[PDB]
Amino acid sequence: EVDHLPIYDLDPKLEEFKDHFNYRIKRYLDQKCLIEKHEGGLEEFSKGYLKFGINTVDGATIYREWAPAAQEAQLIGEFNNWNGAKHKMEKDKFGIWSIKISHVNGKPAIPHNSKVKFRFRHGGGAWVDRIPAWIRYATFDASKFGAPYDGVHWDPPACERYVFKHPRPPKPDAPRIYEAHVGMSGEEPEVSTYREFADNVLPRIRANNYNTVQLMAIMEHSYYASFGYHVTNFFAVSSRSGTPEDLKYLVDKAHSLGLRVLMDVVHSHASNNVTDGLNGYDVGQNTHESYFHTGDRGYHKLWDSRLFNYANWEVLRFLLSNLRYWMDEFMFDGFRFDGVTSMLYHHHGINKGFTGNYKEYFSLDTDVDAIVYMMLANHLMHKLLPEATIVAEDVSGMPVLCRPVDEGGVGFDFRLAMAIPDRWIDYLKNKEDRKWSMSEIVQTLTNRRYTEKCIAYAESHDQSIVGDKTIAFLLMDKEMYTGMSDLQPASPTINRGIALQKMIHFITMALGGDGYLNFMGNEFGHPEWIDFPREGNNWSYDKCRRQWSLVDTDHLRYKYMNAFDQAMNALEEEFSFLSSSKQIVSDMNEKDKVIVFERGDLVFVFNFHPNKTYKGYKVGCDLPGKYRVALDSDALVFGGHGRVGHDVDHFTSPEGMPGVPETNFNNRPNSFKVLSPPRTCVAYYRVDEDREE
Known about the structure:
Shape: globular
PDB class: transferase
Name: Os06g0726400 protein
Number of helices: 15
Keywords: starch-branching, transferase
CATH class of the largest domain: Alpha Beta
Number of strands: 30
Helix content: 10-25%
Strand order of the largest sheet: 10-11-14-17-18-19-20-21
Largest sheet: 8 strands, parallel, barrel
Distance between the termini: 59 Å
Strand content: 15-25%
Assembly: monomeric
CATH architecture of the largest domain: Alpha-Beta Barrel
């Protein structure tokens, strides 16, 4: 299949695995061919949410629910006082139940914003009442069992439907992503709303010159502390933060500010909550009549959750239609697929362990059903929205995960650089400054496939396990509580931490990939850590908030990390270095603790030494001429000591002959000399003497 793939041009080591890729591509073409034959193709098949769930047509309301294991089924709700006797559904030969309910005096039989459930029985058992799988909203009562949830028919009148005003922005040259969770986005540890987030937080994201918002925890999840990772109602906007119309307002406002918006797609697993989610449909049937595999294959041991059978036709309808639903109905510009490592392998990456050996990537442990779903998904999404960005969350480093389906790849645009936050946490927790290796830093940042695109980030929320301390807090710890006044000179510990927080974020951005990501609050060095109420912390909720008050006051020093973050993104907007394939690390000086490198058109000098200033430190560069400061972390506006001269011309000298590297300086054909105070990072640009002076 069939027979040379363009991926093999890129990475001829893939040809050893031709048999694997022949089978995968055959499975994909055959699944796509069947969807064309039986469902009118991928664009038609992924409009399932107009067929399943509750849809109002002229004069009547139809509801369909796939439940082959049910033997009788009815629709119940406030609209029939929870008695389904006059609302029995009919079952077709595929186990799809349907009912059509005429309007009552010209009005829909099921009022907008009223509660509903699917009622079914089998085996002569009692009625079981569950939430329709394609419900678009669900709310909890909070009359003890603190639940269960109810499904809510959502069909707002004209006065209450959000109508999008703004077009989607163009795809940027590189994504600079602000990742967020709306419920913990408020000052106080109460659940914040989509409207609050849209009005209070989107402006800050745009002020810091991000161009993309990654919105976590959108799909409904009855367990708040799951951070949106255990999904119950895949078509429903999480109700604790507002309604579907509130989310549409938020996405439209982001677009109005020039920001793209991606949603987290959690199609790697489903919540095991029986009353509230899709696990309610499992009554012990064979996997062909379930959303899920059975036995071990249907259970994720680490996430304590259920695992989809991606070969099942109704599950492909469900998941592909869910992608179209979020894109088309809420105007998203793309998505991140969370937990792709679990999808790619039958062992889910649970006990491993990827060494980069290709045998680990392509073997009987590779889950072809899951890869076929992802290829159909990426073919579909880029056909609906050719400028979409779809990110994969994959720790394994699977080759060709981020090459187009039409080349033989899985079709993602970018993957996350999941190994970089681990390195900084180990360094910050376990290594005295003098033992940090400049070469190990560079290797971690630069260790990637250059034929595929990477989003780098220095730190993250940690919620796939339990949140850890932020970089700032790992640097400064309890001194952040009493040592952040801008009135008083900072202690040595606070001066160290502010300077390294800026340096660690900026080297990560400039060397770590082709896109950048920042989670909400870390751009200003928010202290402490993120955690949600659970047994392990005695049900503490004081950490599920963001203390904007810290960055909004000019009397503290958070404003300085924030100003640097704004300037580092503006620098990328100006020079476009994330989209440059020029990346040359010219000096990893271990004794002096200096790293010099070029990315794009800029020369970067990082002095991680605790106390030494290098005067006249020679740095290699490509083009001769006159260089000046482009961004300097020592500037007073970024809380530094203002030691670097922004007006100073740095003239180059020639270093041997271009392409005779032994005659060059650190393999570079010119050099210039800089001032490099301790714990600073400065990027320099070449003056265009035809256009500047």
